[PDB]
Design a protein around this ligand. Structure first.
Ligand SMILES: Nc1ncnc2c1ncn2[C@@H]1O[C@H](COP(=O)(O)OP(=O)(O)OP(O)(O)=S)[C@@H](O)[C@H]1O
Lengths: 268, 681, 41, 123, 319
């Protein structure tokens, strides 16, 4: 009942402010928790901080089981603001571990903004470099309704989880379950499918000449494939008649092509 | 190198005929003389000579001198190629074994054989110890003598590797096998006498705890009643139940046997007396009273079999619990590169698992303070499980020397299988595993979901489900799987995980361990994959298969309920491996395992040829006599080349894997399965 | 009625006209007024 | 380390050895119950869940000999748990008693005459 | 009773076969068929008895009297009987069994022995008599069509496409075409014997009409030979023309809701003597009466308690 002065204070700005906030939150959570065990362990938790850190989930669920509607609603609003306000790793790991502890119980997950915040927590799990949690939350988002953005993010998550075959299966599902050739060449770029991405970029450019980021991808494909000749030929034909934000992006590929063909005079 | 390439390319271009064989032979001999220290050239020369033997034998089956001219350098080159490997020479050893068994009686091949046995080392025979003992009772003198000499050398150098199958083969019913085994055993007591006596005592003592007297009499009467009242074969039931009277006539030796004698011995004596009165003067008037007494004994025995749930060693076998130290090694764990573990003690209480066969739960205690839990199996032949475990070890060794599968940690989980007789044995106990049926059962018992909900929906939509046609059963099955969300395994595996990283790693291991076992079971021909035969490791996520009783597509060619599926791939196994489907880790792992098994088809072909051609083990696949073995090995050869779906074309790995996926997960094939197989799970 | 085999397995010329009458008629089709159908409706 | 020259020398040695592939690195190279209890995998009810997780939290600091400063308050908290539960505190005995007796064996000073006393209350 | 120029009956899984008439949709007689389900039922051309065949027995039910019992039972086969039929003068039975056989039966209590057997390497799903009562089509689970003439004892086998089981086949009474469907919905139509003289039995593939993405379960012509209805597992019954083989009429029982998920398939259908009104059997525990022109249903019979998989509808020859 008396936890709103620790949760809804609305004065945290910096990193150590959030750390001392979670410190005071853990101590006021373990002090009065309606259980003799955590209340007795609070006196030692005042002197040792990792013990108050590991006893966070049990204290949280014991305090959550006793509050009513309005207090737990301000509680979930405060934990949403504490999630979306900062970017430090320790507090985000603490809140993610608390959320996965709560969703492992029989009472279900603690309700966030929309559908237990599986769109929020995964976006907090990708930046915290906990990719298994982000993959699980994106699978939970995929189980409701499949969209191309979820498939693209599944490819992006499964690539940095050292799983190329799972991302290849995601591409196979996207190609045999949609059937309109919505597959962008960046999807083949992430899978290192350089020939397929090259055929996709030539499929996209031969119909119409468009703005940049469409030939830079073809340059990246032909660079990673190992053809310096056509790369340098496509670079020299468009190096002059192009803007400023593209030469800074294509200059290293131009130098790589000039080195691969051995033309140092253009490489300089 | 280029001579070997010339021979390989000429074989790939023009096949095997009577015009290309001397050319590739002269190329291979040129390569072997050009190198003289290359395993590949000697191996290619030896397999080329063996293939020449096979072709010239198959040609005259639709002279014995050209076969000699091609078998003697085959044995020479194979014995040369054995010594070059030093780590893995199982295929070459099986090739010298089959040449030894088929043409080892000829006086010229015997020269190369007796040179080769003295040439190579003695550990290279430790991998072919069963396949030797399966041919110990051969009716030819010189090959049998050299087999006996090799077995005596193995027993002299490595006594622990040979004592268990020797004491298995000693207690047989055939004359030649038991006297040859007793001869080799009594020659083994010269340098090691305590080990042979302790091993005979241990084997003869825990063959008795496996099947007690009342279980033996129950099984024998249940067989003889079926035989007499279905086939009218009095001399069949006589040979069925007279060894029971023979083993009952030597006196009870334990308290349980004395109890069985005091309970049923007068009826089992008077029934034998009436059977003898019938056999002397033939009249059914003497047989009806004997069968009345036998049915009374059977009905009294059958009521006390569900009550059996524990065995104390003071009551069942008083010689096992007073050992307290032994010279025998713990069964299933002996390798010549590590110090041996001896049997120190045996626990004085066994727990009987309540089932139709009642397997005991034996737990020994080794010399290093570690408990070895086993499973004492009766009423079952464990000579097939040992051969499929050897095949699985070969497949693990094949996957171990490949770069793309070693980085993915692809392997099959094995357990020890130690047979003790024709109908009893000892299976190693794998810890931390749980049955696939006993996981969905607990998940549905916890989530308040009924167990047979899909079967109840099927019986409610149509009461005569098993009597419909194919299309009606397809409609009922599709209505059952559409009205039921099958996601028990995925949420069950996610609920029992501490975090998401361990859950993801376990799911990855589960997928890439299911795929390997699916492809290996397709190549082998595994059947009867109901959820009581698949186990999940709760600590690593891997998949363990058991009950290797239906191999080589026996379950596909049975009459009542034949299965039309290569492996088990249902909706519960598919919804728990990934979120998109089986096109991710599963298909790529299947491609990898299939191309590894196709690149090394000769080794698995040699192992399966040594398995199938055994005359004492090919009785389960035949329910001339050598025609079925040929047409089974031909089917296996079709599976490993992509000529299994159609013979006029050759499919590669992705097309074959896609056809197997479409065949295994089709509703028309799943709708025809038995209801105990649970095709909706 | 159960089933018994070994029936008419030797007479070819008798089986050529025993049950294969090859009755092919009713070539001319005529129109109608749909008496039962209109009576039902 | 923070000196830039030392980091430059370190990555120079790293390049001079040179780009070992990760599988060769992984070739060259209980505590499971606490992970199941801190997440409550066994799904014990919450009334008898706080004693188990508090006992694991007390045992995590009572196991180490480096932090021997708060040993009196973890011991009095353990006695508080064992008196407050009642007859159901028998399940925590195999995890509390060997560490308790090992601490009594390894420690020193006037806390030892304390610990034995508290041990008596456990008895 | 059946003292009426038109008769109608349905059968299914509710262990009864229902007889009714399309005047108000009320049942007249419920005949008790127990211990098995009915695969197919056919009325005798003399309009005296009906025959229900399913799972190793063929049971006759009398039409003039009121008897709920199987007066004459045929046994001897070891599995199901897919389809049965009679000679147009009531002389012999053609019965296709589930296991491997298509056989003949003699309807008189005498030793005529005009019964023969036809054995193939596949479980057969459909049999069809030729309209001149001389040939017979066998369709099995290997996609093979066995054109077997009863005059001789040699049979043609025709495979349009292997690896797919064909389900039905039928010939119009005018003897113009021969259509057949399989387990992927393809409907091939071969031109039948044009050799009225000496039964040469030439077949040329006229068309394949691609429709019915799900399983296609039964295809039937019309007695006027101007229409052809086929039923499929997407809960549809589509009637095509014989002129250019385009789509005449589409009928569906789909509610348009994602909450049903194929609540019942389209099992059987039949035409009338006018080829104007059809009766359809769906597995939504009821049968319907539709018209080939207006599309909307005209009648419904919902007296069954389970699904129904076969129906018989014969009327007088005039129409
Ligand atoms: N090798 C093993 N490792 C761990 N558990 C095993 C092993 N073998 C058997 N079990 C367990 O023992 C249970 C019962 O043993 P089984 O011998 O399978 O019983 P059963 O039903 O008589 O066997 P059959 O031949 O399938 S009828 C198995 O279902 C598993 O739970």
């Amino acid at each position: 009942i008396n936890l709103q002065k620790a949760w809804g204070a609305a004065r945290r700005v910096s990193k150590d402010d959030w750390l001392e906030w979670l410190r005071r939150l853990s101590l006021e959570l373990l002090k009065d928790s309606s259980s003799p065990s955590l209340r007795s362990c609070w006196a030692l938790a005042q002197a040792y901080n990792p013990m108050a850190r590991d006893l966070f989930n049990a204290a949280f669920v014991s305090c959550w089981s006793e509050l009513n509607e309005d207090q737990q609603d301000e509680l979930i609003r405060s934990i949403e603001l504490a999630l979306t306000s900062q970017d430090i790793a320790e507090v985000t790991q603490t809140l993610l571990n608390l959320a996965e502890f709560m969703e492992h119980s029989d009472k279900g997950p603690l309700p966030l903004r929309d559908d237990n915040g599986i769109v929020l927590l995964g976006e907090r799990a990708a930046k915290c470099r906990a990719y298994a949690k982000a993959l699980h939350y994106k699978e939970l988002e995929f189980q409701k309704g499949p969209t191309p953005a979820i498939l693209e993010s599944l490819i992006s998550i499964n690539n940095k989880l050292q799983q190329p075959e799972a991302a290849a299966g995601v591409l196979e599902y996207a190609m045999k379950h949609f059937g309109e050739l919505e597959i962008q060449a960046t999807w083949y770029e992430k899978l290192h499918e350089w020939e397929d991405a090259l055929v996709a970029y030539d499929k996209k450019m031969d119909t119409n000449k468009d703005d940049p980021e469409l030939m830079l991808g073809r340059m990246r494909c032909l660079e990673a494939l190992g053809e310096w000749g056509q790369l340098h030929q496509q670079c020299c034909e468009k190096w002059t008649l192009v803007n400023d934000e593209t030469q800074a992006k294509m200059a290293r590929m131009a130098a790589a092509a000039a080195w691969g063909l051995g033309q140092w005079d253009s490489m300089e | 190198r280029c001579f070997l390439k010339l021979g390989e390319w000429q074989l790939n271009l023009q096949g095997i005929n009577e015009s290309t064989i001397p050319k590739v032979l002269q190329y291979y001999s040129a390569a072997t003389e050009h190198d003289r220290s290359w395993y590949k050239a000697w191996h290619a020369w030896a397999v080329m000579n063996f293939e020449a033997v096979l072709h010239y034998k198959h040609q005259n089956q639709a002279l014995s001198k050209t076969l000699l001219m091609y078998t003697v350098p085959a044995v020479q080159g194979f014995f040369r190629s054995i010594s070059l490997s030093r780590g893995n020479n199982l295929q070459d050893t099986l090739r010298v074994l089959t040449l030894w068994f088929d043409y080892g009686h000829w006086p010229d091949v015997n020269e190369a054989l007796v040179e080769g046995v003295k040439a190579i080392q003695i550990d290279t025979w430790l991998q072919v110890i069963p396949q030797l003992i399966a041919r110990i009772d051969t009716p030819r003198p010189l090959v049998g003598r050299l087999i006996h000499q090799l077995l005596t050398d193995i027993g002299r150098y490595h006594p622990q590797a040979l004592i268990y199958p020797l004491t298995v083969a000693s207690k047989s019913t055939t004359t030649a096998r038991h006297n040859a085994a007793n001869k080799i055993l009594k020659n083994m007591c010269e340098h090691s006498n305590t080990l042979v006596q302790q091993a005979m005592m241990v084997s003869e003592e825990l063959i008795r705890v496996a099947i007690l007297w009342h279980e033996m009499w129950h099984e024998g009467l249940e067989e003889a009643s079926r035989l007499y009242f279905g086939e009218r074969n009095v001399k069949g039931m006589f040979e069925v139940l007279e060894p029971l009277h023979a083993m009952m006539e030597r006196g009870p030796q334990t308290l349980k046997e004395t109890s069985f004698n005091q309970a049923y011995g007068r009826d089992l004596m008077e029934a034998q007396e009436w059977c003898r009165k019938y056999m002397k003067s033939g009249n059914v008037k003497d047989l009806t009273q004997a069968w009345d007494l036998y049915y009374h004994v059977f009905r009294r025995i059958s009521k006390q079999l569900p009550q059996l749930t524990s065995l104390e060693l003071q009551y069942v076998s008083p010689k096992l619990l007073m050992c307290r130290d032994l010279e025998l090694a713990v069964p299933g764990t002996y390798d010549p590169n590590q110090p041996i573990i001896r049997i120190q003690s045996i626990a004085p209480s066994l727990q009987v698992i309540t089932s139709k066969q009642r397997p005991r739960k034996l737990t020994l205690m080794g010399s290093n303070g570690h408990e070895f839990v086993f499973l004492l199996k009766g009423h079952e032949d464990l000579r097939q499980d040992e051969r499929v475990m050897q095949l699985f070890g070969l497949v693990n060794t094949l996957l171990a020397n490949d770069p793309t599968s070693l980085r993915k940690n692809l392997s099959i989980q094995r357990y020890a299988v130690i047979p003790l007789s024709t109908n009893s044995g000892l299976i190693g106990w794998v810890p931390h595993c749980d049955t696939l049926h006993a996981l969905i059962r607990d998940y549905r018992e916890k989530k308040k979901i009924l167990l047979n909900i899909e079967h109840r929906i099927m019986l409610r939509m149509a009461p005569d489900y098993d009597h419909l046609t194919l299309m009606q059963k397809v409609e009922v099955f599709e209505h059952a799987v559409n009205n039921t969300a099958g996601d028990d395994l995925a949420k069950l595996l996610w609920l029992k995980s501490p975090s998401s990283e361990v859950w993801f790693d376990r799911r990855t291991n589960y997928t890439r361990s299911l795929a390997v076992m699916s492809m290996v079971g397709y190549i082998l021909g595994l059947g009867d994959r109901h959820p009581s035969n698949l186990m999940l490791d709760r600590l690593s996520g891997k998949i363990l298969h058991i009950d290797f009783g239906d191999c080589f597509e026996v379950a596909m060619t049975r009459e009542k309920f034949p299965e039309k599926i290569p492996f088990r791939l249902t909706r519960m196994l598919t919804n728990a491996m990934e979120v998109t489907g089986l096109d991710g880790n599963y298909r790529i792992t299947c491609h990898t395992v299939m191309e590894v098994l196709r690149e090394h088809k000769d080794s698995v072909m040699a192992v399966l040829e040594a398995f199938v051609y055994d005359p004492l083990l090919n009785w389960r696949l035949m329910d001339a006599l050598n025609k079925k073995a040929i047409q089974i090995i031909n089917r296996v050869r079709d599976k490993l080349t992509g000529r299994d779906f159609s013979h006029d074309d050759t499919l590669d790995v992705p097309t074959q894997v896609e056809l197997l996926i479409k065949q295994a997960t089709s509703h028309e094939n799943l709708c025809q399965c038995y209801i105990g197989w649970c095709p909706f799970w | 009625i159960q089933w018994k085999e070994r029936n008419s397995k030797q007479s070819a010329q008798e089986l050529k006209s025993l049950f294969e009458k090859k009755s092919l008629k009713e070539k001319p089709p005529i129109s109608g007024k749909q008496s039962i159908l209109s009576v039902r409706l | 380390e923070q000196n830039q020259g030392t980091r430059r020398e370190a990555i120079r040695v790293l390049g001079l050895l040179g780009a070992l592939d990760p599988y060769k690195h992984k070739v060259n190279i209980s505590d499971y119950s606490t992970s199941e209890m801190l997440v409550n995998m066994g799904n014990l009810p919450l009334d008898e869940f706080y004693p188990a997780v508090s006992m694991v939290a007390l045992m995590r600091i009572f196991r180490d000999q480096s932090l021997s400063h708060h040993h009196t308050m973890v011991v009095q908290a353990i006695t508080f748990i064992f008196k407050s539960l009642g007859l159901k505190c028998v399940q925590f005995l195999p995890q509390v008693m060997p560490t308790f007796l090992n601490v009594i064996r390894v420690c020193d000073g006037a806390i030892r005459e304390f610990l034995f006393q508290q041990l008596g209350m456990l008895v | 009773v059946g003292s009426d120029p038109v008769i109608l009956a349905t059968a299914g899984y509710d262990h009864t076969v229902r007889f009714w008439q399309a005047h108000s949709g009320i049942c007249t007689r419920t005949v008790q068929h127990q211990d098995s389900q009915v695969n197919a039922l056919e009325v005798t051309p003399d309009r005296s008895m009906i025959a229900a065949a399913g799972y190793q027995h063929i049971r006759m039910y009398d039409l003039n009297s009121n008897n709920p019992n199987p007066i004459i039972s045929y046994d001897g086969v070891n599995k199901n009987i897919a389809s049965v039929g009679f000679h147009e003068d009531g002389r012999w039975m053609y019965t296709g069994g589930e296991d491997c056989t298509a056989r003949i039966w003699d309807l008189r209590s005498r030793n005529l022995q005009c019964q023969r057997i036809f054995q193939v390497n596949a479980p057969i799903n459909c049999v069809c008599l030729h309209p001149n009562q001389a040939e017979l089509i066998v369709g099995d689970q290997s996609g093979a069509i066995h054109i077997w003439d009863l005059k001789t004892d040699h049979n043609e086998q025709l495979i349009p496409e292997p690896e797919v089981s064909i389900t039905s086949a039928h010939i119009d009474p005018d003897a113009s075409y021969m259509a057949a469907v399989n387990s992927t919905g393809n409907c091939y139509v071969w031109n039948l014997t044009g050799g009225i003289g000496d039964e040469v039995t030439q077949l040329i593939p006229k068309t394949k009409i691609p429709a019915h993405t799900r399983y296609a379960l039964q295809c039937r012509f019309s007695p006027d030979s101007t229409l052809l209805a086929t039923c499929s597992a997407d809960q549809t019954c589509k009637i095509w023309r014989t002129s250019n083989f385009s789509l005449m009429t589409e009928l569906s029982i789909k509610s348009g809701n994602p909450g049903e998920s194929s609540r019942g398939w389209m099992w059987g259908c039949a035409f009338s003597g006018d080829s104007q009104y059809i009766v359809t059997a769906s597995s939504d525990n009821l049968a319907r009466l539709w018209c080939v022109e207006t599309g909307e249903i005209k009648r419904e019979y919902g007296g069954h308690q389970k699904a129904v998989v076969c129906l018989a509808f014969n009327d007088s020859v005039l129409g």
